[PDB]
mmCIF file of C-alpha atoms in Angstrom:
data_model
loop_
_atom_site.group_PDB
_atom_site.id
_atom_site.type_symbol
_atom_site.label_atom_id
_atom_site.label_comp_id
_atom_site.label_asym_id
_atom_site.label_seq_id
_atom_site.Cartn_x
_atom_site.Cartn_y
_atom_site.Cartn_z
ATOM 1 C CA UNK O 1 0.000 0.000 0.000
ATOM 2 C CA UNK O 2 0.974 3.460 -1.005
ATOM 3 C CA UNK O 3 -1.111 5.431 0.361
ATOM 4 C CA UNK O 4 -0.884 5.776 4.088
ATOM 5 C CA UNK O 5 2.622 6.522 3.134
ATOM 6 C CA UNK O 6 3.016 10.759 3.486
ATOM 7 C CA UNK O 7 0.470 10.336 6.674
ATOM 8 C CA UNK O 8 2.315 10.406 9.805
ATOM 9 C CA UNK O 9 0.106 8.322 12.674
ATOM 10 C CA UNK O 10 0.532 7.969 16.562
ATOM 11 C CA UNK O 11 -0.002 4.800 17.799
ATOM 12 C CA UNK O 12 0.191 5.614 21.529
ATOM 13 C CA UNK O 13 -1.312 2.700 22.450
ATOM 14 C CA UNK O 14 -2.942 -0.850 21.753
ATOM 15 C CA UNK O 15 -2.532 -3.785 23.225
ATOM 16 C CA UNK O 16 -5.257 -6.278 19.023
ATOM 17 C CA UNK O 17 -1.463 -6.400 19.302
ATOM 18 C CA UNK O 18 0.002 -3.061 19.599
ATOM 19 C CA UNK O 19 3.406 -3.522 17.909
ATOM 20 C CA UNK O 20 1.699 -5.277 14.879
ATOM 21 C CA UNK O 21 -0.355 -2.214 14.384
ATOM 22 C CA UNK O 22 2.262 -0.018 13.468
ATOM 23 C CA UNK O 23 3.559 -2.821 11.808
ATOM 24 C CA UNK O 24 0.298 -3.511 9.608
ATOM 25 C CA UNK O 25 0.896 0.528 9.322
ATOM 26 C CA UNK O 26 4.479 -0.401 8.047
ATOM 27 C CA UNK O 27 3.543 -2.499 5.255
ATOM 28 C CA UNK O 28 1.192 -0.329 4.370
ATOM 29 C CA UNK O 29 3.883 2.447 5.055
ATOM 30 C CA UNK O 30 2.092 4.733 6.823
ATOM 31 C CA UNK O 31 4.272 6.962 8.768
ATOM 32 C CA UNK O 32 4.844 5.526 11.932
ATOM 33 C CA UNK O 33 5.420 8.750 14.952
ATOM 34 C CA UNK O 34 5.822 8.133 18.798
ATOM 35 C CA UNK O 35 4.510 11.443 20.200
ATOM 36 C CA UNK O 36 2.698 13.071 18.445
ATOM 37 C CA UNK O 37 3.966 17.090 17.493
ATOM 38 C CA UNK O 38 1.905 19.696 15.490
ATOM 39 C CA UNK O 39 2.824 18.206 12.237
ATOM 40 C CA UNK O 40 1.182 14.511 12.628
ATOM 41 C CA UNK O 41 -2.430 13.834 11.121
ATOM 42 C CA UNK O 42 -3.927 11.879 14.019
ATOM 43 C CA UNK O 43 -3.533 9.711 17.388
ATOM 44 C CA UNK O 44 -4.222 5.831 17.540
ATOM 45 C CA UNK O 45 -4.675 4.297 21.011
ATOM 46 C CA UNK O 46 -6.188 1.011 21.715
ATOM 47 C CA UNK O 47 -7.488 2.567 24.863
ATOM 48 C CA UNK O 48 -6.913 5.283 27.439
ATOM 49 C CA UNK O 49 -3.326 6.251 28.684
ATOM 50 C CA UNK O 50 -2.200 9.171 30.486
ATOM 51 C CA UNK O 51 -0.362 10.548 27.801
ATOM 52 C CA UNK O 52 -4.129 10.374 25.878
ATOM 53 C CA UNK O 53 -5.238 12.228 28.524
ATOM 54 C CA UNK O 54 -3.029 14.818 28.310
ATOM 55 C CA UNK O 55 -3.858 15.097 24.464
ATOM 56 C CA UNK O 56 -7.528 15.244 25.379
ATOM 57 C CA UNK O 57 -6.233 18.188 27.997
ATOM 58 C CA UNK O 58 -4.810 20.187 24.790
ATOM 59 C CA UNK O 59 -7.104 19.700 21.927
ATOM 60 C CA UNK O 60 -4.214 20.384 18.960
ATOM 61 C CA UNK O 61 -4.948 17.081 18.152
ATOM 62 C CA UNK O 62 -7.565 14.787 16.643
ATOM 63 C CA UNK O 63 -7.885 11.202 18.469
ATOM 64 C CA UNK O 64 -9.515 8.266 16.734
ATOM 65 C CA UNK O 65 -11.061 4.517 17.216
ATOM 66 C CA UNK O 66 -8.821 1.874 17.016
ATOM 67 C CA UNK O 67 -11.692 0.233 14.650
ATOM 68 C CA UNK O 68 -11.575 2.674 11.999
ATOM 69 C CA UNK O 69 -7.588 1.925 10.872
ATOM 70 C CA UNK O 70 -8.457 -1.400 10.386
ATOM 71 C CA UNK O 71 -11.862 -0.534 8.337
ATOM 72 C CA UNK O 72 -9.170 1.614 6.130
ATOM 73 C CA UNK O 73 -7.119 -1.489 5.671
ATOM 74 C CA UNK O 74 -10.131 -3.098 4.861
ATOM 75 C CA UNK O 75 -11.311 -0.467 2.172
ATOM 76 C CA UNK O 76 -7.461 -0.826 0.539
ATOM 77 C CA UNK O 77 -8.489 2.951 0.684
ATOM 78 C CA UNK O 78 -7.915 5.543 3.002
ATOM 79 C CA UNK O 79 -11.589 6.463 4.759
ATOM 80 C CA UNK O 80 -11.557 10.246 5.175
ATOM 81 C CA UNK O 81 -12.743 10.692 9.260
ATOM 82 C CA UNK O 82 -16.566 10.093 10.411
ATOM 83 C CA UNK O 83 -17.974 11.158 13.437
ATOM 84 C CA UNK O 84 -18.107 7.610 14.617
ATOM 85 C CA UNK O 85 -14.476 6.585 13.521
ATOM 86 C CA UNK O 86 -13.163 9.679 16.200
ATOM 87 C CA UNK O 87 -13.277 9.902 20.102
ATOM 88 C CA UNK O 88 -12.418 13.236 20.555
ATOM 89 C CA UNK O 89 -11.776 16.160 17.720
ATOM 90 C CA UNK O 90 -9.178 19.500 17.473
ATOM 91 C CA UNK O 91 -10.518 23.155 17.464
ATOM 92 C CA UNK O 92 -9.889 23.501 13.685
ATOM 93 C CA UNK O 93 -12.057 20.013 13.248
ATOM 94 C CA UNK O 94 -14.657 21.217 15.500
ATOM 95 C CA UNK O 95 -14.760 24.691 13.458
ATOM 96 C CA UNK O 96 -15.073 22.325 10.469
ATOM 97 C CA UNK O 97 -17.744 20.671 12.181
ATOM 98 C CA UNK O 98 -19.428 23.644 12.957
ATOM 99 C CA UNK O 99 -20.036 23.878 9.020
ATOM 100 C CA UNK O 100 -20.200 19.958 8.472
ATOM 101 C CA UNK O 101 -22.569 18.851 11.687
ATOM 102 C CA UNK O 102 -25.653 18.885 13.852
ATOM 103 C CA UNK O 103 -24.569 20.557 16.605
ATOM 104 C CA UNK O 104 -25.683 17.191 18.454
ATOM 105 C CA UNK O 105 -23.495 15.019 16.112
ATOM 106 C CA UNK O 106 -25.215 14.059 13.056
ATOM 107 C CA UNK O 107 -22.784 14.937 10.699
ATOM 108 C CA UNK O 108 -24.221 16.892 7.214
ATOM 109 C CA UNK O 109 -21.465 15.901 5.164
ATOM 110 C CA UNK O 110 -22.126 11.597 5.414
ATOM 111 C CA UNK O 111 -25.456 9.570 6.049
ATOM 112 C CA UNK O 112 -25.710 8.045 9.065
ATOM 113 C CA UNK O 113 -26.617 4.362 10.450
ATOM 114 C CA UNK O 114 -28.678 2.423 13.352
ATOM 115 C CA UNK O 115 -25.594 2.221 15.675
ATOM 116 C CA UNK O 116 -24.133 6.025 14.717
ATOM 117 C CA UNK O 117 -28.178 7.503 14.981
ATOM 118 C CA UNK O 118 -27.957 5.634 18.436
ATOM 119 C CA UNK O 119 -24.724 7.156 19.690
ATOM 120 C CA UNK O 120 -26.010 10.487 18.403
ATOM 121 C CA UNK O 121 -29.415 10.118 20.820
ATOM 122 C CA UNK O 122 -27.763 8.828 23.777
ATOM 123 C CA UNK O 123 -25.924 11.806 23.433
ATOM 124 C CA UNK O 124 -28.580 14.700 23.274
ATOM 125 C CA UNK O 125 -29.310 15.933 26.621
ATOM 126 C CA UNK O 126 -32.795 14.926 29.188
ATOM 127 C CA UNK O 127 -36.034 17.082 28.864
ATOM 128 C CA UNK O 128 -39.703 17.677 28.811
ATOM 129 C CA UNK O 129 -40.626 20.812 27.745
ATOM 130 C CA UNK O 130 -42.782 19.984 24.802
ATOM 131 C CA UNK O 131 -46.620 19.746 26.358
ATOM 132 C CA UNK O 132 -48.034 16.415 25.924
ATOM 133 C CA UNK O 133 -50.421 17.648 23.792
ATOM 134 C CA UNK O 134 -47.616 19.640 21.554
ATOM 135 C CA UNK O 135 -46.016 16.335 21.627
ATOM 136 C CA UNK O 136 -48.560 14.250 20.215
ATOM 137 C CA UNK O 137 -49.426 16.393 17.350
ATOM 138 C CA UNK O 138 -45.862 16.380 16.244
ATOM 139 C CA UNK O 139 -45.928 12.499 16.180
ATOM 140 C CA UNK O 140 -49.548 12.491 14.571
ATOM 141 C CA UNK O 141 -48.075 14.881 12.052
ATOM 142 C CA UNK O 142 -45.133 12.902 10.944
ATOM 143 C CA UNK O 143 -46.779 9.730 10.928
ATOM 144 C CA UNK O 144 -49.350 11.451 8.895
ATOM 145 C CA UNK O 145 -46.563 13.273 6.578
ATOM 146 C CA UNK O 146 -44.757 9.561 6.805
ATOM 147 C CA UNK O 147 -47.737 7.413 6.403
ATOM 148 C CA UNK O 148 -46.810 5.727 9.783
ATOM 149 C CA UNK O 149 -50.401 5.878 11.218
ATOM 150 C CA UNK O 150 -51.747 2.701 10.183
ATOM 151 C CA UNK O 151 -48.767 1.246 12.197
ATOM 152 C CA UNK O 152 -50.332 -0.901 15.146
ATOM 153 C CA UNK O 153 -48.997 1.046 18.110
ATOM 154 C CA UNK O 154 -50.328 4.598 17.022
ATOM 155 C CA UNK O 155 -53.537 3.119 15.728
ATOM 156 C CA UNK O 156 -55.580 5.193 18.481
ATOM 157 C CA UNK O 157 -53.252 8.347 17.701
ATOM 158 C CA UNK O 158 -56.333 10.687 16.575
ATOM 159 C CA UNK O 159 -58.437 9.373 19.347
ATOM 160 C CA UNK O 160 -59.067 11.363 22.465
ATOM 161 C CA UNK O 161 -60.403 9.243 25.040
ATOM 162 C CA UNK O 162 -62.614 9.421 28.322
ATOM 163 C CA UNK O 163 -62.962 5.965 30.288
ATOM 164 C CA UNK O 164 -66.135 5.272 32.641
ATOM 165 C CA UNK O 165 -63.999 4.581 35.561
ATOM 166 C CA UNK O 166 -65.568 7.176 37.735
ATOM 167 C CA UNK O 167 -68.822 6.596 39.397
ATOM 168 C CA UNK O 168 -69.290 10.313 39.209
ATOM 169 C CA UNK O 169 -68.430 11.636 36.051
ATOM 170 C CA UNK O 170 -65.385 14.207 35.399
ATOM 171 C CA UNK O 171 -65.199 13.807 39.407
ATOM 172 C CA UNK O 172 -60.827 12.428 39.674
ATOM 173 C CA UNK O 173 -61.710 10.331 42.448
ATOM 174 C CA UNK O 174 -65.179 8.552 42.061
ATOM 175 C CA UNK O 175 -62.726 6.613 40.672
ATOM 176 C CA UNK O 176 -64.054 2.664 40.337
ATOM 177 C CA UNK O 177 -60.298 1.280 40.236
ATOM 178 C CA UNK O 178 -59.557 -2.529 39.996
ATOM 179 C CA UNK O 179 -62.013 -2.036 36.884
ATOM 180 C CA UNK O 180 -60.958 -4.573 33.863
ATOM 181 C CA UNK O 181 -61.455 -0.900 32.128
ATOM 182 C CA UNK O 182 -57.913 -0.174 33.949
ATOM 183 C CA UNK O 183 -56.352 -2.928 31.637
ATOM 184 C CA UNK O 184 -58.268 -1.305 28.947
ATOM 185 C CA UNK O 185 -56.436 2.529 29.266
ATOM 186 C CA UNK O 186 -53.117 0.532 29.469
ATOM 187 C CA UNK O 187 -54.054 -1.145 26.182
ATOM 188 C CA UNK O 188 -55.218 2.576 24.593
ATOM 189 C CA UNK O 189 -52.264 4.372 26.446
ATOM 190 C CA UNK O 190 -50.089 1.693 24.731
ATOM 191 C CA UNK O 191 -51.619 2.190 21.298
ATOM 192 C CA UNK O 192 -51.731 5.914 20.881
ATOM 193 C CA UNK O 193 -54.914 7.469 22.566
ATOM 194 C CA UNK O 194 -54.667 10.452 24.404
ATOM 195 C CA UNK O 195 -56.571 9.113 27.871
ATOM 196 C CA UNK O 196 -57.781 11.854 29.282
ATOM 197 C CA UNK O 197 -59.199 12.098 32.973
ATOM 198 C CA UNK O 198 -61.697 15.005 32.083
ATOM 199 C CA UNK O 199 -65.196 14.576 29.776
ATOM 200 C CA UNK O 200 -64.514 18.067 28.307
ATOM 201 C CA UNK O 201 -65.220 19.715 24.586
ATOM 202 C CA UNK O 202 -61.552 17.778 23.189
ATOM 203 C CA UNK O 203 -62.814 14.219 23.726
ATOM 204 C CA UNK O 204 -64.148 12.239 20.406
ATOM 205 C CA UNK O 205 -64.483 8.620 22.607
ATOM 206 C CA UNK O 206 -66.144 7.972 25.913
ATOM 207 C CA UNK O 207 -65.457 3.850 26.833
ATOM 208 C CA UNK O 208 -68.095 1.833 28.790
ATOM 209 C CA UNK O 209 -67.860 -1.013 30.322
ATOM 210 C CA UNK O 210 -70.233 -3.296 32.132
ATOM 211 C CA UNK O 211 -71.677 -0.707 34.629
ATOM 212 C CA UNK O 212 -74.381 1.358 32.253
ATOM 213 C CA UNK O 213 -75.490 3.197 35.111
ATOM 214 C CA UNK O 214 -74.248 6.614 33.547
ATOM 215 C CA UNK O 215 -74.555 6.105 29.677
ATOM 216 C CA UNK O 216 -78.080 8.347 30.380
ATOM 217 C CA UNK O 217 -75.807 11.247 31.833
ATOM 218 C CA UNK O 218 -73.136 10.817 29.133
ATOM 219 C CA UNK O 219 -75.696 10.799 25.940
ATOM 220 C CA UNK O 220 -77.934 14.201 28.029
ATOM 221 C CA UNK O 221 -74.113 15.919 28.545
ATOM 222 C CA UNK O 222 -73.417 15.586 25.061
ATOM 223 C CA UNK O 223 -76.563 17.161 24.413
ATOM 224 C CA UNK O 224 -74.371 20.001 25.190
ATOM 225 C CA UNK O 225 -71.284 19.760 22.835
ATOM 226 C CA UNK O 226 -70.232 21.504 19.457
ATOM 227 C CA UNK O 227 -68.046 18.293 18.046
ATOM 228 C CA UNK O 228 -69.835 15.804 19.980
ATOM 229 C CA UNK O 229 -68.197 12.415 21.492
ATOM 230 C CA UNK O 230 -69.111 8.528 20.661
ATOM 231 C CA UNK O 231 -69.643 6.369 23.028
ATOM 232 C CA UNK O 232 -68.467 2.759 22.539
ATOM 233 C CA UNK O 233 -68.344 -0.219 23.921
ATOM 234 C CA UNK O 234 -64.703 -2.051 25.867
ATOM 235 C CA UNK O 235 -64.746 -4.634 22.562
ATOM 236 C CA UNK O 236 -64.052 -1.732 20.108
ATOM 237 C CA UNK O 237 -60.745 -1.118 21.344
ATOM 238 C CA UNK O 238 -59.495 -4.753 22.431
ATOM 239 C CA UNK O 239 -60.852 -6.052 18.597
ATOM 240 C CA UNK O 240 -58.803 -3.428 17.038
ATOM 241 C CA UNK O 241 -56.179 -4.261 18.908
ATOM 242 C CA UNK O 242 -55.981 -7.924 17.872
ATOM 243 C CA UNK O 243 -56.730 -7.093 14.383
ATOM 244 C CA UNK O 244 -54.034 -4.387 14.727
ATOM 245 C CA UNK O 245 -55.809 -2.193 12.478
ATOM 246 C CA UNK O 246 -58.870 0.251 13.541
ATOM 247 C CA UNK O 247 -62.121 -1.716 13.428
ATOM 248 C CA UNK O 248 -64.849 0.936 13.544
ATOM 249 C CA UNK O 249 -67.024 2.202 15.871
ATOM 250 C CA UNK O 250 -70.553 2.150 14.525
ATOM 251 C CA UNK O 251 -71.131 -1.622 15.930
ATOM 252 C CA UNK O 252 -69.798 -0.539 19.117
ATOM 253 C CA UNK O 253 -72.153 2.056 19.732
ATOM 254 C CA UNK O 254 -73.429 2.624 23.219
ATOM 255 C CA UNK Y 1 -61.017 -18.638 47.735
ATOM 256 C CA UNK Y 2 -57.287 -20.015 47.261
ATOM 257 C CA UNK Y 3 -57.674 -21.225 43.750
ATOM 258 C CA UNK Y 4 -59.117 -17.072 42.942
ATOM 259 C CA UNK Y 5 -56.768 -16.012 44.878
ATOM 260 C CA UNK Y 6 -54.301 -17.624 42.946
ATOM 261 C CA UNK Y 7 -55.884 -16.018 39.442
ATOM 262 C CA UNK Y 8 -56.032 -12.411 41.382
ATOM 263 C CA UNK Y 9 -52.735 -12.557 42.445
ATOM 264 C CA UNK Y 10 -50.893 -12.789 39.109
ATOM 265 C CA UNK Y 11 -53.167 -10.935 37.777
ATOM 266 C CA UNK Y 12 -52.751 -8.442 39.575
ATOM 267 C CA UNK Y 13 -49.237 -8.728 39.052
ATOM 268 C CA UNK Y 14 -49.190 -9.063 35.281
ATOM 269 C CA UNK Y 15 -51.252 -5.652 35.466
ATOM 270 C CA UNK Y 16 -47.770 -4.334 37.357
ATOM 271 C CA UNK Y 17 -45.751 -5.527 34.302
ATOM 272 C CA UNK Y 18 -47.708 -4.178 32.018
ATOM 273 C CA UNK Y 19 -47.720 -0.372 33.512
ATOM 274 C CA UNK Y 20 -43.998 -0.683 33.603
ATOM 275 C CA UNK Y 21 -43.952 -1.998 29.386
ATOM 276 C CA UNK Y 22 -47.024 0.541 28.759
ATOM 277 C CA UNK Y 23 -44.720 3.400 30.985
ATOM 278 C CA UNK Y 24 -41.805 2.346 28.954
ATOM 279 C CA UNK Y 25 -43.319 2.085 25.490
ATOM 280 C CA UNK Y 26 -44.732 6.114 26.325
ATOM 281 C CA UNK Y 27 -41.487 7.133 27.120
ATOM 282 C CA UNK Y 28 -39.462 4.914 24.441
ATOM 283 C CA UNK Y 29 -41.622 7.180 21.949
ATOM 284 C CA UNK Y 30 -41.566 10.867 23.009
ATOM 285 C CA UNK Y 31 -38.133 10.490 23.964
ATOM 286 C CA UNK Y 32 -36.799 8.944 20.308
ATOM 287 C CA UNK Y 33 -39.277 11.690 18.792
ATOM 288 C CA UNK Y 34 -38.131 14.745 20.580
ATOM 289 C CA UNK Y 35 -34.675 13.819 19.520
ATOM 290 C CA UNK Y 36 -35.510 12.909 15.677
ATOM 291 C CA UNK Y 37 -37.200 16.326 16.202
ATOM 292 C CA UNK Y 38 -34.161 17.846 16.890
ATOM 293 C CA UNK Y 39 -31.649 16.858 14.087
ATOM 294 C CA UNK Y 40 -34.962 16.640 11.555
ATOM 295 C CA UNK Y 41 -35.421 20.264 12.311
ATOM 296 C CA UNK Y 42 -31.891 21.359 12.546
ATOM 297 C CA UNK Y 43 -31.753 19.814 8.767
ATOM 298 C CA UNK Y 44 -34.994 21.654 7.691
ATOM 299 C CA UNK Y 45 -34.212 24.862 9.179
ATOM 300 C CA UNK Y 46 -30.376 24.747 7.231
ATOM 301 C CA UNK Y 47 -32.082 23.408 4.297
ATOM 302 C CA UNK Y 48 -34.995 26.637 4.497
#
């Protein structure tokens, strides 16, 4: 190999047998240095010395995977550096980066791959800000935009849900719990409804189960309503489930 | 009474499991969105 020749390498550590990797270097000739100076392209190490962490300490160098040498070796072809083939970059690289990246890692300039989009998430800080309900018209957008909505999971999506589980209704605790209608919210939590704990104007759905004593104060409340609610029966939700596709609502009425 | 018991019992606990895979599942989702959402809009907005 000729090419790793005129590239000048540090491998400042290794042991993968550390004195065969300069020595795969040397018969590919590239240009073997023991500390590193301003001049070399990049630092090798098989792990972490002290000596790496005194190159982390000054950034006027770029330090790489011990993977991506051999994946060069293994192109017969020098692989020009990926985010994933680095563990830590120089200021002139991260000023490149600045034009070549997501500021999170995603790199512009090359596509990206389960394992790299993985690293790249792990990465991006903790937080909540988005409101729920923000939240779930961004996903019911891009699975609309996508054509993701049919998908099992997010079947319920564009259904907002109330769920007879309160003997007094809109009241938070008249709440009838052991209910098998508490199975039933984990099954429409799990598959995309918005389960809401108030019968207000935003609900499409109101679920009954065995206990009808309220479906007479459900149909005369949405006497009141603009955009006025179904009610359905439990089996409406459980058979779309198991058919993993909607099944629809107008044999499940009341 | 011990046989129902019995039936209550892991169900009951099955019920426990399955908050913990429906919690999970809820979070699995926003959390892998909101950070799509990031990088997809950080391409959009260079792209605009």
């Amino acid at each position: 190999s000729n090419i790793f020749e005129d590239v000048e390498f540090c491998v400042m550590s290794g042991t993968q047998p550390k004195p065969d990797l300069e020595n795969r270097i040397a018969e590919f000739g590239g240009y073997i240095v023991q500390n590193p100076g301003p001049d070399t392209y990049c630092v090798i190490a098989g792990s972490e010395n002290i000596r790496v962490k005194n190159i982390i300490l000054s950034n006027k160098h770029d330090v790489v995977k011990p993977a991506w040498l051999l994946e060069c070796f293994k192109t017969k072809s020098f692989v020009p550096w990926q985010p994933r083939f680095m563990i830590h970059m120089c200021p002139s690289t991260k000023e490149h980066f600045a034009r070549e990246y997501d500021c999170y890692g995603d790199s512009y300039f090359i596509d990206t791959d389960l394992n790299q989009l993985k690293e790249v998430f792990s990465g991006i800080k903790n937080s909540n800000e988005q409101t729920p309900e923000e939240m779930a018209s961004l996903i019911a957008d891009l699975e609309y935009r996508y054509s993701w909505d049919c998908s099992p999971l997010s079947m319920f999506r564009r259904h907002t849900v109330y769920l007879d589980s309160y003997a007094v209704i809109n009241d938070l605790s008249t709440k009838n719990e052991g209910t098998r209608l508490a199975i039933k919210a984990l099954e429409l939590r799990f598959h995309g409804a918005k389960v809401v704990s108030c019968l207000a104007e935003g609900v499409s759905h109101v679920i009954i189960g065995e206990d009808h004593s309220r479906v007479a104060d459900f149909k005369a409340f949405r006497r009141t309503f603009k955009r006025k609610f179904k009610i359905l029966k439990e089996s409406w939700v459980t058979d779309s489930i198991d058919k993993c596709e909607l099944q629809e609502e107008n044999q499940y009425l009341i | 009474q011990k046989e129902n018991e019995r039936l209550l019992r892991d169900w009951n606990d099955v019920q426990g499991r399955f908050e913990k895979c429906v919690s999970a599942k809820e979070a699995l989702e926003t959390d892998l969105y909101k950070r799509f959402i990031l990088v997809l809009n950080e391409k959009k907005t260079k792209i605009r």
